[PDB]
Design a protein around this ligand. Sequence first.
Ligand SMILES: NC(=O)c1ccc[n+]([C@@H]2O[C@H](COP(=O)([O-])OP(=O)(O)OC[C@H]3O[C@@H](n4cnc5c(N)ncnc54)[C@H](OP(=O)(O)O)[C@@H]3O)[C@@H](O)[C@H]2O)c1
Ligand SMILES: NC(=O)c1ccc[n+]([C@@H]2O[C@H](COP(=O)([O-])OP(=O)(O)OC[C@H]3O[C@@H](n4cnc5c(N)ncnc54)[C@H](OP(=O)(O)O)[C@@H]3O)[C@@H](O)[C@H]2O)c1
Lengths: 261, 281
Amino acid sequence: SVSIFGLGAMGTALASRFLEEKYKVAVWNRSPEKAATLSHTAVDGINASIIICLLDNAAVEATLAGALDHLHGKTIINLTNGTPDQARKLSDRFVSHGVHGGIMATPSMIGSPYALVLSGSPDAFKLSVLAKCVFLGEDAGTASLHDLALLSGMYGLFSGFLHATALVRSSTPAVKFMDLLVPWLGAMTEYTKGMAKQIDEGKYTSSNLAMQLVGIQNIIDASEAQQVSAEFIRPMKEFMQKAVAAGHGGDDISSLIDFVK
Amino acid sequence: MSSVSIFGLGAMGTALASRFLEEKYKVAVWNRSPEKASSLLGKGATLSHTAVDGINASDLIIICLLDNAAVEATLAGALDHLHGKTIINLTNGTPDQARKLSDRFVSHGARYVHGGIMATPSMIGSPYALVLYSGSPDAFKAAEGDLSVLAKCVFLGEDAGTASLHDLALLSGMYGLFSGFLHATALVRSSTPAVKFMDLLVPWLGAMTEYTKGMAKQIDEGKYTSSNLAMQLVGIQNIIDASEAQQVSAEFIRPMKEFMQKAVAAGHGGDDISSLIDFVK
Ligand SMILES: NC(=O)c1ccc[n+]([C@@H]2O[C@H](COP(=O)([O-])OP(=O)(O)OC[C@H]3O[C@@H](n4cnc5c(N)ncnc54)[C@H](OP(=O)(O)O)[C@@H]3O)[C@@H](O)[C@H]2O)c1
Ligand SMILES: NC(=O)c1ccc[n+]([C@@H]2O[C@H](COP(=O)([O-])OP(=O)(O)OC[C@H]3O[C@@H](n4cnc5c(N)ncnc54)[C@H](OP(=O)(O)O)[C@@H]3O)[C@@H](O)[C@H]2O)c1
């Protein structure tokens, strides 16, 4: 038996999957619309069986407030994306009354092979139907740090996609352009493997920051001419400028790592 | 047996020049500074003393410099000796720089084509080397044979600046990727090491790279139907708050945030991240 809170795109995908493996799923929402046992209140859903999955951790505190009374005995798995510190404040608040997972998966991928979920009380932890489990510490907010990090790299990628598509829209359609992007991103995703190595040791040895700078300026000039915003690339430019100024004129794009603090 | 004449001996024009030698060509070479950027005729190259001597060295001319300004500057040389030649400018630049050059050089009897080298120097000659070419397709067809030694040719229009548009676009998406890598690494370094972290990033980016295929489709038709911009916004705010707490800069993500804020405000609260395409324009 499990009892879910939050029936958005992700909490439903999760709830649906627990059903397909024949579980006793209890479910709750602010605004109900289910397909399961429906918890009329948060108290009735707390006493049902606990996989929370909401908009923020504020919503976690807000919703579970009323149910101060029956927390004693339960094992709260918060899948809600958030900060490490939010997660630690919640873990201490809830352990005072008797974990965390970053779902590295879109809803459609839940139950799929490529689904993955990243911390907290390892007694309670010791889910697998949903995705490939990956525990990594008794630190209640370690999963959240790894969530946000991975998302940071995602959001880099989408920022490039959007800029790249936008910049070419006039001349060709986006799909016919994926014929060139998708391989190229593949190449460039490889080059980041041979950059984490540099970052881990401290090489940064030369495709030089001086020429890339005059390159990035050609994208900005070209973006304005195509009526596209180059605001996706500005931080990259600001960081390469810190680098050549600080002496890395002839060093690799790895060198910027020390200028992002 | 087949003769080429290069201009510009930086990291890229040397890689190119070196490769033409390894396929036993009659490679002529030129630079601003020869005594600087090596003119090792040792591997067989012929040093053009002036731009004129390098223009007359061959009828295939592969330029590759810092900017197009350097292209115009160097070839100025009252370019009367240009009639008959096939100028391949691999110099990264704007579509409009490329069109201004193509008209300038076609006025002097030459036949211009332009190329975005989608390849670092070490990749030149390799399987994954790729070069986009646009410009006079008459000139490109004749010299497609020779150029093919360097990378996989990919022609796409008689528009002298189409290769440059595709160059800068692809680079824009590269720079997005590195911006995410650096931010993502940075944010995690002080809890776990960058290499052990590529074990999670590299697959995940693979997933997310697939999702961009089914997003170009949306962008091409006009769906944007829901993974919603309202929740991602409170997500992106958690990365900014988390970055400050780890003493890391969240400056890589700010434009994304500014764009999602334009989107939910303009009504796309429940739409997919595809919807943002119309808010970069
Ligand atoms: N979708 C993805 O691709 C994806 C992937 C990985 C992780 N995630 C994570 O999943 C979390 C939820 O996923 P989602 O995509 O399902 O977002 P979602 O559909 O918006 O989930 C939000 C849920 O929380 C409830 N809620 C919203 N505001 C509330 C409030 N003020 N008080 C109480 N309850 C509230 C909603 O129900 P009511 O509106 O009825 O209250 C809704 O069911 C996200 O924050 C994100 O961390 C999403
Ligand atoms: N390396 C890569 O990863 C890569 C990848 C794709 C495309 N590219 C492009 O290939 C081209 C060259 O790249 P690179 O890495 O060789 O650049 P680099 O490291 O700066 O090479 C500099 C080259 O530009 C010349 N130059 C500078 N100012 C000039 C002027 N006023 N007149 C004539 N020549 C001038 C230099 O001459 P000196 O010898 O006197 O400096 C030298 O030939 C650029 O357009 C670059 O954007 C490079």
